[PDB]
Amino acid sequence: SQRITIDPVTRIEGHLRIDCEIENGVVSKAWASGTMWRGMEEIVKNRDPRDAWMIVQRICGVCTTTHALSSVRAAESALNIDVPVNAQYIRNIILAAHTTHDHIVHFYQLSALDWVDITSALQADPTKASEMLKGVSTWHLNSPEEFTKVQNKIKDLVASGQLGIFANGYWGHPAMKLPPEVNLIAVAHYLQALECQRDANRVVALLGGKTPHIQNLAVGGVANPINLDGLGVLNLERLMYIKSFIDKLSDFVEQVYKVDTAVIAAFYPEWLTRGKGAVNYLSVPEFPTDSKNGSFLFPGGYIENADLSSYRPITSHSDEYLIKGIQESAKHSWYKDEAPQAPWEGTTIPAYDGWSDDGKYSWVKSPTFYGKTVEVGPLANMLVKLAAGRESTQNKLNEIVAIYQKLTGNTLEVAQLHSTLGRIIGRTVHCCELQDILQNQYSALITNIGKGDHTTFVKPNIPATGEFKGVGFLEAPKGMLSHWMVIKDGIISNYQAVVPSTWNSGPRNFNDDVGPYEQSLVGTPVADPNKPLEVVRTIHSFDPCMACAVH
Amino acid sequence: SQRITIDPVTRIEGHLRIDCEIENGVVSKAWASGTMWRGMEEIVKNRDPRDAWMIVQRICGVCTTTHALSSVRAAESALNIDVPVNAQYIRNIILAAHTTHDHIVHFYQLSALDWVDITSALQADPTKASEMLKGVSTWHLNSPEEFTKVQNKIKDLVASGQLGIFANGYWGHPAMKLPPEVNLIAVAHYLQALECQRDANRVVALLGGKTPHIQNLAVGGVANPINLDGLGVLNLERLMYIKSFIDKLSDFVEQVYKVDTAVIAAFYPEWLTRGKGAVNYLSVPEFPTDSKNGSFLFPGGYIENADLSSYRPITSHSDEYLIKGIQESAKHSWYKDEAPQAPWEGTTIPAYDGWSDDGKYSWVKSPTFYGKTVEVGPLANMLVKLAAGRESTQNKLNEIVAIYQKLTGNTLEVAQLHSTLGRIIGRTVHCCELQDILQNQYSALITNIGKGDHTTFVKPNIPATGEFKGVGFLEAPKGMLSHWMVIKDGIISNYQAVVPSTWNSGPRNFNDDVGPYEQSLVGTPVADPNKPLEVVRTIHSFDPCMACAVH
Amino acid sequence: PQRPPVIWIGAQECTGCTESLLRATHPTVENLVLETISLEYHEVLSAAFGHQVEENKHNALEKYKGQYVLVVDGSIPLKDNGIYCMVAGEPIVDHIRKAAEGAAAIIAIGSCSAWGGVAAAGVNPTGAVSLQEVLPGKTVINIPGCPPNPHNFLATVAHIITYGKPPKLDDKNRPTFAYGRLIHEHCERRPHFDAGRFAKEFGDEGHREGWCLYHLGCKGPETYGNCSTLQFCDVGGVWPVAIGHPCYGCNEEGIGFHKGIHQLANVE
Amino acid sequence: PQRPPVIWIGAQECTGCTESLLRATHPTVENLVLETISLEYHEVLSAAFGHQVEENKHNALEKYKGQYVLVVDGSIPLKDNGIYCMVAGEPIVDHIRKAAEGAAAIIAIGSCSAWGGVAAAGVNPTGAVSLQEVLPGKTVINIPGCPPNPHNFLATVAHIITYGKPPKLDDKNRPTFAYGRLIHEHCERRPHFDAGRFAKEFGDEGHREGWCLYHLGCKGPETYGNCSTLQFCDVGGVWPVAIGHPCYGCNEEGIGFHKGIHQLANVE
């Protein structure tokens, strides 16, 4: 038996420490720790509600856009502002394109090197690698010639003796199961992913004004001036340019990312039976399309004890059942006030006292929903959509299962989705469904402008007396996000962010109940305690973002 | 004897009419006719010499940059101005990148549909098409999946019943020899060529200010402000951006265009034995690299009666032997003054009298070199480089010959280059060698700026009295270009352009000698006189530009 | 689905206005011709030639009567009864007037077709005129520049296709989204103009700091266009002034091809 | 051939400064790490984690002593002996000071490392400070913005590699090619400012005509940067003002994260 630390965890956003007790070659107990704090909630306090979004967007640059959009929704909630529908279409295109970039980069740049052995790719036969994909993908860049060019780049890097960020990786580890050919295919797709995510961010840039950190929002709508006949503003030429990038995303997503997801499951089927983090799941509906902050294209809901048949739908960002359930505790976090707090009454008073296994060991708070631990993110999102009977989601999951079936002769049941690989599958399904969101909202915008609606912004008024509370919900790439603003005498008197990685990464709670990361690791086999690749595989499946978790 | 007219000739620049006498299915005599005139030589007269280049660049938008560069060189010649070496590097990068775009578009968009049958591509097996290229090309976009996607685009266009610019083409013509698979490969490459030429024009744009029609020249150098530390000027960031596009060109050029050129020769070897236009060839050296308008990267020269061993090298744009040899006649052109004229004494007095087989039948003048007809353009350029013993040229031709030999078991002799296919080969060899020009001149620029030379421009003085004469030579994509400027009392008193398509397309001359286009067509077999595809194959090999030929 | 038909006729053109399409990205020329429109006649790209391509044009003018967009590049020469541009043995003015009879919309792409351009300058050797001059009864949409940014044209066509009418036009029938403002009333070098910070010669210290090009002959003050905002080639930062050379006024009748490069503009 | 080594350490970062690299085109991030540099330590992309990646860093600091470029994003928190950012059980200030000892050049990428940025704003809960404040004896090159255009960084590194020295710097050690001028002294909307043509609210008639954003709170008059010229993402025409929103001053200490969006700038 022994105690290990993984510090830093790499190929995530931000500063994470994982500790594990290992007994009989299996993790028996784990600790997740966010090791950096900024106090972004305190920084934004006492300012004009209209200014918050530009400050709190800087909670995170990986999930850029998300905190900006949640912040304006929170101020709009407090003020009772209904956002113009053109502003919703623009906000939705930005969030969908951003999320496409975010998921692609997660699967390839952050996660793939847990599953892929680049040294093994040097032994691959490029022609055999290409032949393996016949009838599996229609992607146009799986030729032996592409694969030979990629193999030669790896050869040249190894030959230089400067491996840099590829150095001292887990090459030849016993948990690395891909054949040489499949390792080479994965590296080729890793490089191709960088082109696709660049195109996704060109969509974001043309509406946001730049990315990272968009600059087109406002409490009351957006700053984009719609005028098809206007020089220097959002005209038909600019919209055609946006559409030219939207159109470039689908083929990679459907023919590479979706297929690679099915193939990793086919080679690692044991990872369908481990990394369960919770039995409760939450997601919020997303992509409002009406004039009153509703009519979401994606549904939300709450699943309790893995029961899809009895889930509770959430159709509104003003749902009092959702609002009243959410609390956070700092019993095992480095803050002073430990009892569960509703975020409108939340405090963030730092109380660092160092690491204690049984005391405080994280800057991440511990969120609960009506006193229960909950997993959020793409697995939650997918399970809620399956519970809602969403045909688009059923059909897309079925396409991944059909590739898995063809490769293995086995099927995938919903029970197998409560796992490390299920989490990865939910993320991929989300990325695929987002391409229809982009086509739908671009078309909606063009149609609405054509009806003569160029409105984008309604100037708010903020009473100089009174106390008003608002909450802005958003289904972020990592899961349900909420910003909670209290306005008193015209200025922000409280600001609390409850972020998806807070839900998943948070330490033991007021009742010493274990959060998703810590729960998911129990039972993980660790072949080599000095090189705990298996632990990092499960932790990466949640797409940790610690700037998000802690803020 | 049957008389046919081809009017308009399509897939060229501008307005061309070709007439042929056909005896027993073989062309016995031909007429070339430029059918549009603007009088660009008269339009530029009586202006400041500094203004000419902006006006005469508009001679042509296909060979954009070329008339601009020849015009400033002509003014610099008259004024005895030595251009700063940084201005030469920038001019050279623009001309090389422009010529890359120009040759790629000529081979694919203008010429390929003479040789390629798109309806036959519908019967192709995409897998068999891909297998044909194994060990023939290392290009990464020759997969069955790429070819299936392209085949489906053709299928969808045919299914629409709206063929547009693909309608009423020469599908099933007896002179179409490619198998279905090779037709489908060619259409895939046609579409891929459009991406490569777009990257070439991004190079041109970043130095020129736009393309078509660059805007960075001056009599005395260039308008680009070199300052690595300057905001809003040509700094290291902008140079890195230019380099990023230079780097994108080589793979298509070497692995697609060069290979397709060898393959077309392999399937059409009879076209190595017809389309000889002349026995004399001229090219000027190009890409000056010193401070005195010389030290050219590419050599020039004069070949008489196809004898490479006795050719005359041309190493200077001030060569009196070259200057004194050039004259133009209008005996069979629609101008008044018919005796051969040296261009400094040239006139362009319109005298339209309609078509006459034995009289005037073209707006193109008839150029001669010491009284001989001469072919210019890539065939001339290649043969002069071979005569010079340029190893880069011999090696690149040998790479095309090696692919041809692999497919046919036959070699290619220099005698077989005096032909329609030899002309196409010389164009491809030029495009391939230009990629090393771009690398060389980008490196030269970075190195020179690093030595502390940021100079770009020498302000001219123009005497207000006196008469003085200058000539600007340039090796354009279609061949040797010259602009001839006479300055009198500070303004342009004469301006004459002698353009490469003038040499090739001009009508019968003062001695009734036949020019290259007209001579090349003698002996052409014409299977169907209603659909004379064989005539257009030979004419397109010269890359006709009639806005250039006539101006 | 059926794509909207286009007939493209070149008169006294240099082909730069067609070549602009090969730099376009939204749409690319391949997407334009396979997805956006049906290009029924274009002599630069047509598989057919001679009698076959003239048959294609006649067939398309009949089949798509009242439905096609007619595009013309180049000026139209009237001198000597049209003989300075002859296609298939007839003056181009006759081909253009025949195609204009059944057009749904008519576009003059480039300065030459919009107002005569370089081909009509100086002594005007061929009596070159604008497309609007040869079609007095017709509303010609003018998309000037030499050549324009291709999207000035493509977004005009897209507005016709998507919304069923032309974009809003100024009093020269130019689309306002592209030509509604003087370059100098939207130029990033205006602060330098305002401060008297001027380049005096190419390569001088002010020029190498990106100062205003007014004293090099910049025609921005007298030229309507979008060169400073839309710019060119979609790479960012690329227009004549940003590269270091004054605007020549190529969009604007009486400026481009009339005024010398270094001649000073009038400022409003 | 050997590539110049780089060590990248994140302190109180949001990761947006690393993410800027994924938008870069010259070079792209894949060409940066395979061709331009050897990225010896970067926790966002590293195959190795925990003990293995800390071994990589120690080895690289020894092997490349006097040769590597050190890059830091995020502010460095000094309050309570550095415990507001702990990596491998040690305050990030100690990791940064150790890596700084053997650096050939040191770059603060982003407003947080360049001057404290958003993490140091308001009451500054963690005593966040700039990289220059933690390295008083060292010349820190500052590449501010939140995040900067990635080429402001990549062309700085390229100048060091290609010409063997930093680019020319202003008195805040910012490269002059990117930060040498106020945004308002090279802004394409300056003509509208000069004429009193101002947007008063988003979506109003002036805003929908691309007028000046001064009265919406534009901080261009008090912010040094290249946002109006180089802009963002290399697509053409993309920066906050061109999209319709005022500059917030994110490049500039005392402007971004201090002044309200709608608070008016001082004009020089």
Ligand code: SF4
């Ligand atoms: S407008 Fe300019 S680019 Fe277009 S045809 Fe006329 S000269 Fe050529």
Ligand code: SF4
């Ligand atoms: S004169 Fe030209 S460069 Fe100067 S501000 Fe006006 S348009 Fe810009």
Ligand code: SF4
């Ligand atoms: S400068 Fe901005 S983008 Fe960079 S770390 Fe700081 S908050 Fe993030």
Ligand code: SF4
């Ligand atoms: S206030 Fe802003 S928008 Fe107006 S001119 Fe200045 S920098 Fe440009």
Ligand code: FCO
């Ligand atoms: N997605 C994302 Fe970031 C996290 N966790 C937020 O919200």
Ligand code: FCO
């Ligand atoms: N190339 C080209 Fe044009 C022709 N002919 C010129 O010069």
Ligand code: F3S
């Ligand atoms: S010369 Fe023409 S392209 Fe624009 S910058 Fe001036 S109107």
Ligand code: F3S
């Ligand atoms: S907010 Fe920042 S990104 Fe530029 S436009 Fe202003 S300095």
Ligand SMILES: [Cl-]
């Ligand atoms: Cl509108």
Ligand SMILES: [Mg+2]
């Ligand atoms: Mg919080």
Ligand SMILES: [Mg+2]
């Ligand atoms: Mg001439």
Ligand code: NI
């Ligand atoms: Ni995040």
Ligand code: NI
């Ligand atoms: Ni030409």
